[PDB]
Amino acid sequence: RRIDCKVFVFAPICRGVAA
Numbered sequence: 001r002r003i004d005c006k007v008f009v010f011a012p013i014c015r016g017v018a019a
Contacts, residue, residue, distance in 0.1 A: 005014035 003011050003013050005011065005017065008014055
């Protein structure tokens with residue numbers, strides 16, 4: 001449920017806040 005973008009930077013959910 002919670003994805004750490006600090007580690008999962010390839011996650012498709014962190015791509016939403018990528019920009």
